[PDB]
Amino acid sequence: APQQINDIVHRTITPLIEQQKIPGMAVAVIYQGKPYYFTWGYADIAKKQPVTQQTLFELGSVSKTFTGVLGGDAIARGEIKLSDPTTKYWPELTAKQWNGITLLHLATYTAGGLPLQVPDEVKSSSDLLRFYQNWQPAWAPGTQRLYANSSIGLFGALAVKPSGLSFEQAMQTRVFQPLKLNHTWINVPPAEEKNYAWGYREGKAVHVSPGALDAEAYGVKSTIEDMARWVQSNLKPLDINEKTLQQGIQLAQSRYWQTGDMYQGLGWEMLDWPVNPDSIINGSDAKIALAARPVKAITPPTPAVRASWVHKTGATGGFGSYVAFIPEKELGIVMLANKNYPNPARVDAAWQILNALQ
Ligand SMILES: *[B]([O])([O])[C]([N]C(=O)[C]C1=[C][C]=[C]S1)C1=[C]C(C([O])=O)=[C][C]=[C]1
Numbered sequence: 085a086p087q088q089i090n091d092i093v094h095r096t097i098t099p100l101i102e103q104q105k106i107p108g109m110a111v112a113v114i115y116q117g118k119p120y121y122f123t124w125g126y127a128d129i130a131k132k133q134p135v136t137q138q139t140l141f142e143l144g145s146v147s148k149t150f151t152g153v154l155g156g157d158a159i160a161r162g163e164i165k166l167s168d169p170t171t172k173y174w175p176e177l178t179a180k181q182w183n184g185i186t187l188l189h190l191a192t193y194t195a196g197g198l199p200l201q202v203p204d205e206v207k208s209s210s211d212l213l214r215f216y217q218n219w220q221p222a223w224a225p226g227t228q229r230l231y232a233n234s235s236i237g238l239f240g241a242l243a244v245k246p247s248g249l250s251f252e253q254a255m256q257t258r259v260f261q262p263l264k265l266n267h268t269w270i271n272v273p274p275a276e277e278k279n280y281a282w283g284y285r286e287g288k289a290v291h292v293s294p295g296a297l298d299a300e301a302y303g304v305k306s307t308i309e310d311m312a313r314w315v316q317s318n319l320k321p322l323d324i325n326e327k328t329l330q331q332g333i334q335l336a337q338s339r340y341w342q343t344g345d346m347y348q349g350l351g352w353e354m355l356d357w358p359v360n361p362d363s364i365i366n367g368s369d370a371k372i373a374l375a376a377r378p379v380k381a382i383t384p385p386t387p388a389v390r391a392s393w394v395h396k397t398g399a400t401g402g403f404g405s406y407v408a409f410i411p412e413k414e415l416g417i418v419m420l421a422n423k424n425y426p427n428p429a430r431v432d433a434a435w436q437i438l439n440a441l442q
Pocket residue numbers: 144145146200201233292302397398399400401
């Protein structure tokens with residue numbers, strides 16, 4: 085690999101692993117459209133299994149970027165419209181607070197304060213309907229952004245309804261397969277367990293537990309190679325042969341709302357480049373605080389901007405992931421770890437690396 089990439093990655097990540105006590109980590113840097121991989125430590129401490137380029141990590145909320153692109157692909161296929169009322173897909177949502185809430189609001193966390201998490205007690209389809217029917221919005225739709233699994237999660241579930249496929253089948257056939265993400269999974273098959281890293285929380289080995297809308301909001305597991313290919317695909321959508329998928333990727337990076345320096349896409353979040361780490365942290369869900377922020381609609385949405393820092397953070401109880409890329413520089417990075425460490429530290433490292441290589 086080019087020495088400049090080798091050096092900045094090792095000089096940045098080694099200290100990070102030491103400071104955060106991360107058991108295992110994989111990093112990919114995409115430079116001028118080529119991936120370079122790095123691994124450290126352990127996927128399974130007790131069984132002494134090292135992290136490799138084939139190790140599966142829980143992506144946590146980075147899964148939302150796949151959900152956003154799958155929704156974009158459905159829009160491109162003419163199956164759904166973001167301007168469609170949620171009730172068009174779920175007529176059973178008869179409670180009056182749902183009047184005026186569209187798929188756009190669900191996809192962008194602007195429905196009026198849907199909760200951060202779906203309660204553990206909510207499991208079945210009937211439980212889910214009851215939960216959304218009982219939810220009382222704090223605000224009118226399209227006025228404030230409140231990051232939430234229950235918002236983009238519902239968007240993903242509804243977006244695939246016209247297809248006639250389960251969410252998992254739609255993701256596999258319309259996104260994973262076309263992009264050759266052959267070691268990316270919503271449910272890890274038994275044959276792949278030998279490569280599934282354990283997450284570590286308070287020193288205990290853990291894997292994510294089943295939950296309602298998990299697949300849609302935080303349930304994808306993937307390798308550093310497939311994630312590098314996902315970044316490549318999002319950096320250069322015009323190279324994608326499947327027209328609706330190319331279009332869907334472009335729709336997911338469009339700018340729908342602005343709050344401060346941040347713009348909300350479908351799954352992806354974007355800031356204009358150049359920008360410093362402090363601004364990225366404060367202009368993203370990478371902050372320690374859970375924040376309600378008024379938003380300004382971008383009418384109509386701005387098509388994907390090349391000079392942007394496009395990114396997404398993700399976590400599960402035992403994992404911490406981060407993806408960021410800058411289209412106009414053909415540069416990107418994926419950082420996958422089996423410990424859920426502070427988001428600001430992820431942004432700091434990613435920025436240090438990409439700024440050095442830009
Ligand atoms: B996402 O923003 O990473 C999302 N992840 C999950 O809901 C999956 C998890 C299961 C247990 C812990 S995270 C998310 C993460 C968190 C958090 O800080 O743990 C909160 C809200 C959403």
